[PDB]
């Protein structure tokens, strides 16, 4: 089964990385153990959605393409290694983002930097190592592959887009005209930059390239199937589903119980440009806008409660339903367009959408 293959490959790649640290980097057993625990704590525990998308896209093509059994095994192993490169890339950004944001919990456990024996001094570098491991995986496992060049180039572009998206996210509550490294940044008072187009830019870059575009294209590359698809359609469907995924996350930050969320959501306190805040400002009257401005971005729990009441009273569930209906309509249209050149790839996209939507 796909998941068991994927998890077995994690143990293989971990053993390869740690054994290389011992044979080539002069590591001692205690530091190798620290790095093993860091890898497990930061890479494991999630749903493996991104990595398993690579595997599922590759399985779709195997079902319809003639190959010797050894070639089928090679392609699946490559899809698993590629999927772990994306999981380790995500692990890098979660470790760093948690330190940047001063976060407390991630997936029901303390953020890595908060572990007593880690601290920010080590965790920033541990995050650097996580992303370096993605490149060590690629050069080792894909050394003789025809797709190595395209895969590394895609991966770099996606990583850069993600870092640019993090910049857009962390500065989303500043007035753009005031940004200046030499001057402490005040929070926006007018919220003029909390618009659907600005929110779409943040989300497109901060999450959609690594959560949807990279796994789908990597599945095509390891399958040597990229010429069988219209790349512009793949980008459009990846950016569309990815935005919906971030809207779901934004709603959950505000209203999903902390036990289910795996943390205490603080987007209101952090003055984030969330879908809820943009959608609220898109329908609020003058008194509602004024109440929002007087309470948003404040740690005071009573102020956070005022904001959640404004969102609840504004009936944002109706705006979410209209948005969800439009996304269902557009994703189904793109899936139809993908069937022109590849019904197998269109089906993988339908699975990815179904898993996101539910």
Ligand X SMILES: Oc1ccc2[nH]cc(CN3CCN(c4nc5ccccc5s4)CC3)c2c1
Known binding-site positions: 97, 101, 169, 235, 249, 253, 267
When asked if residue 249 is in the footprint of Zn ion (CB under 5 A), the reply is: yes
Beta bridge partners of 67: none
Going from the C-alpha of 141 to that of each of 12, 16, 58, 145, 279, the distances in angstroms are 11, 10, 17, 8, 46
CB atoms near residue 104 (< 10 Å): 12
Name the minimum Å distance from CB 54 to a second copy.
21
Name the minimum Å distance from CB 141 to ligand X.
35
Q: What is the CA radius of gyration of the chain?
A: 22
Selection from 186, 164, 165 nearest residue 176 by Cα: 186
* Candidate residues 152, 226, 261, 284; the one interacting with a second copy per rule CB under 8 A: 152
When asked if residue 251 is in the footprint of ligand X (CB under 6 A), the reply is: yes
Q: Choose between 134 and 274: whose C-beta lies nearer to Zn ion.
A: 274
* Candidate residues 125, 315, 317, 333; the one interacting with a second copy per rule CB under 8 A: 125
When asked if residue 253 is in the footprint of a second copy (CB under 8 A), the reply is: no
List, in order, residues 6 or more apart from 118 with CB less than 8 Å away.
38, 112, 126
List, in order, residues 6 or more apart from 326 with CB less than 8 Å away.
none
- Beta strand 109-110 with 105-106 is antiparallel
How many helices and strands, by DSSP H and E, does the chain display? 15, 2
Question: For ligand X, which stretch binds (CB under 6 A), given 68-76, 135-143, 306-314, 333-341?
Answer: 306-314
Name the minimum Å distance from CB 187 to ligand X.
4
Share of the chain residues as helix, strand and coil, in percent rounded to the nearest 5? 75, 0, 25
When asked if residue 243 is in the footprint of a second copy (CB under 8 A), the reply is: no
* 226/193 Cα distance (integer angstroms): 38
Selection from 275, 272, 273, 249 nearest residue 262 by Cα: 249
Q: Choose between 214 and 281: whose C-beta lies nearer to ligand X.
A: 281
* Candidate residues 86, 270, 280, 344; the one interacting with ligand X per rule CB under 6 A: 270
Q: 186 touches which of ligand X, Zn ion, a second copy, none (CB within 5 to 8 A by kind)?
A: ligand X
H helix intervals, 102-147: 119-141
Question: For a second copy, which stretch binds (CB under 8 A), given 154-162, 238-246, 302-310, 331-339?
Answer: 154-162
Question: For ligand X, which stretch binds (CB under 6 A), given 14-22, 29-37, 219-227, 265-273?
Answer: 265-273
When asked if residue 183 is in the footprint of a second copy (CB under 8 A), the reply is: yes
When asked if residue 185 is in the footprint of ligand X (CB under 6 A), the reply is: yes
When asked if residue 269 is in the footprint of Zn ion (CB under 5 A), the reply is: no
- Count Cβ neighbours within 10 Å for each residue of 249-269 and write b for 16 or more, e otherwise: bbbebbeeeeeebbbebbbbb
* 237/330 Cα distance (integer angstroms): 8
Find the binding residues for a second copy in span 105-124 (CB under 8 A).
115-118, 120-122, 124
Residues near Zn ion, by CB under 5 A: 97, 101, 249, 253
Q: Which residues bind a second copy (CB under 8 A)?
A: 21, 25-28, 30-31, 33-35, 37-38, 41, 96, 99-102, 115-118, 120-122, 124-126, 128-129, 132-133, 135-136, 139, 149, 152-153, 156, 159-161, 163-164, 166-168, 170-171, 176-177, 179-185, 201, 204-205
């Amino acid at each position: 089964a796909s998941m068991e293959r994927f998890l077995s490959v994690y143990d293989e790649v971990q053993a390869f990385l740690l054994d290389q640290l011992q044979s080539k980097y002069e590591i001692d057993p205690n530091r190798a153990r620290y790095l093993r625990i860091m890898m497990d704590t930061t890479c494991l525990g999630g749903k493996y959605f991104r990595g398993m998308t690579v595997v599922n896209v590759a399985e779709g093509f195997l079902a319809v393409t003639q190959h010797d059994e050894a070639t089928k095994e090679r392609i699946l192993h490559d899809a698993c290694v590629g999927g772990w490169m994306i999981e380790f890339l995500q692990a890098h950004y979660l470790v760093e983002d948690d330190i940047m944001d001063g976060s407390v919990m991630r997936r029901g456990k303390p953020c890595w930097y908060r572990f007593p024996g880690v601290t920010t001094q080590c965790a920033i570098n541990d995050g650097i190592i996580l992303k370096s491991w993605t490149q060590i995986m690629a050069w080792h496992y894909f050394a003789d592959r025809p797709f190595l060049k395209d895969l590394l180039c895609l991966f770099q572009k996606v990583d850069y887009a993600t870092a640019v998206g993090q910049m857009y996210d962390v500065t989303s509550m500043c007035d753009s005209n005031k940004l200046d490294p030499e001057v402490a940044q005040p929070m926006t008072t007018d919220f003029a930059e909390f618009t659907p187009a600005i929110y779409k830019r943040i989300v497109k870059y901060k999450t959609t390239f690594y959560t949807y575009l990279l796994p789908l294209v990597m599945g095509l590359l390891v399958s040597e199937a990229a010429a069988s698809v219209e790349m512009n359609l793949v980008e459009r469907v990846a950016h569309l589903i990815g935005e919906y995924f971030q809207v779901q996350d934004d709603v959950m930050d505000c209203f999903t119980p902390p036990e289910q969320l795996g943390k205490v959501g603080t987007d209101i306190e952090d003055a984030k440009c969330s879908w809820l805040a943009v959608t609220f400002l898109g329908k609020a009257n003058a008194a509602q806008v004024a109440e929002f401005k007087a309470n948003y971005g404040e740690k005071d729990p009573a102020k956070v409660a005022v904001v959640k009441r404004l969102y609840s009273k504004a009936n944002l569930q109706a705006d979410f339903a209209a948005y969800e209906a439009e996304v269902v309509r557009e994703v189904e249209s793109l899936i139809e367009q993908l069937k022109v050149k590849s019904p197998t790839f269109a089906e993988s996209v339908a699975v990815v959408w179904e898993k996101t939507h539910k």
